Ligand binder design. Structure first.
Ligand SMILES: Cc1cc2nc3c(=O)[nH]c(=O)nc-3n(C[C@H](O)[C@H](O)[C@H](O)COP(=O)(O)O)c2cc1C
Ligand SMILES: Cc1cc2nc3c(=O)[nH]c(=O)nc-3n(C[C@H](O)[C@H](O)[C@H](O)COP(=O)(O)O)c2cc1C
Lengths: 219, 219
């Protein structure tokens, strides 16, 4: 190991700037393809996330064809109407007004998966909670989401669809599970607070109400 | 919604630095207490994470007492004994020589939970994959891991336990699930590559092997 400590004031500020201004983007994606170099940078950041037992359970399928985007978007529509019919009155009306994906518009999409069987028979750290491998994959997603913002690339996670329909589109095996579908593209503008808060779907919870001391429920 | 774009060369480098140099720390934690302000910043960061339907399913149980850390440590050991047992001969010995937690060393520990029933009867984006709320919570963890790195603070995830045991020690309800136990403390030395690689457990996988173009298995 080598010497380490806190970043400089400017370095820490750049770190919190990405964490604080990254948004989940749906409708602001610009049409320019992301350079090959920029993509390698984004995947690299993801590849450096931590992973249980250093399993590195992830795979990334790059999707850049209209044909594929169309099939995925339709799978979204089928699922989204279904989700829509799970609400009523004004909350349903409000649900149908939200943009929940940017699939056909984002010049790039990425389906991040988790190979449940990588790492051999037994994987360190996943001996007691088997979901840790999936969680590892999410860490890879956030690292990319954060790297993306710094590059001025908007990223949007889309989870509205029946998994099996997507695995069919991409040919993903049974031992591999989809963790996320991500829409990517440059942006020249972002919301300053979560879009769902601005559109009145749900507001930011008071952090002070979610922190306990020693025991659950104890402030 | 306002104008936005890529970070400056220096800001981008800072974000990538945290991403590339952060590690899972187990045995280098320092006894020095973290200030309440430093803890607010780390928690603030996590709370800036994305969350399905803006669910914000997380809660953070700060642990700072010797007695709690002792009970939690015993839990770890039992779990870890039965885990080591799952490896044979050569590998088992290697497993046993690894340090997989700094529960007793870390001056601060944080149990990050996910309330499966928050957000109402139905929660946006979580109508097809009921796991999206846990995934959201992992995003919170990764933001805290990254901010912590910039603060010169180390973070170590420990998942080798029998969850039911930890829930009982912290008095966590049935509708709430533990996503992660994070050990925290200042750190002045960090491995230059994942500790498990340096110790011969698993090497870094070749990213080129995990990226596909358009469909699974296609280069
Ligand atoms: C696991 C997960 C799944 C998500 N799925 C969707 C989705 O399907 N459609 C969508 O518009 N947003 C989706 N989101 C984004 C949240 O709605 C978003 O985090 C929040 O409303 C805005 O957060 P932000 O302003 O930090 O981006 C998802 C987020 C997470 C963490
Ligand atoms: C979901 C998850 C659970 C983990 N659980 C443990 C654990 O129980 N004990 C441990 O020593 N490390 C644990 N780790 C850390 C990994 O072993 C470590 O991230 C990897 O070997 C190299 O990580 P780094 O690049 O962060 O150093 C966990 C990581 C993840 C993502």
């Amino acid at each position: 190991l080598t010497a380490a400590g806190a970043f400089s004031s400017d370095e820490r500020a750049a770190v919190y700037r990405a964490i604080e201004t990254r948004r989940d983007v749906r409708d602001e994606f610009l049409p320019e393809p992301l350079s090959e170099e920029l993509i390698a940078r984004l995947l690299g950041a993801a590849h450096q996330a931590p992973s249980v037992g250093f399993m590195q359970p992830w795979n990334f399928v790059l999707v850049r064809q209209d044909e594929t985007r169309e099939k995925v978007w339709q799978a979204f529509q089928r699922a989204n109407d279904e989700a829509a019919e799970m609400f009523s009155g004004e909350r349903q009306a409000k649900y149908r007004s939200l943009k929940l994906e940017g699939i056909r518009k984002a010049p790039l999409s990425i389906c991040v998966t988790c190979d449940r069987t990588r790492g051999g028979a037994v994987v360190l750290g996943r001996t007691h909670n088997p979901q840790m491998d999936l969680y590892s994959t999410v860490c890879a997603v956030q690292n990319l989401w954060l790297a993306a913002r710094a590059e001025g690339v908007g990223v949007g996670w889309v989870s509205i669809f029946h998994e099996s329909e997507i695995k069919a589109i991409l040919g993903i095996p049974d031992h591999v599970e989809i963790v996320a579908w991500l829409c990517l593209g440059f942006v020249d503008r972002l919301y300053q607070e979560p879009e769902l808060a601005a559109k009145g779907w749900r507001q930011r919870l008071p952090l002070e109400d979610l922190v306990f001391e020693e025991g659950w429920g104890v402030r």
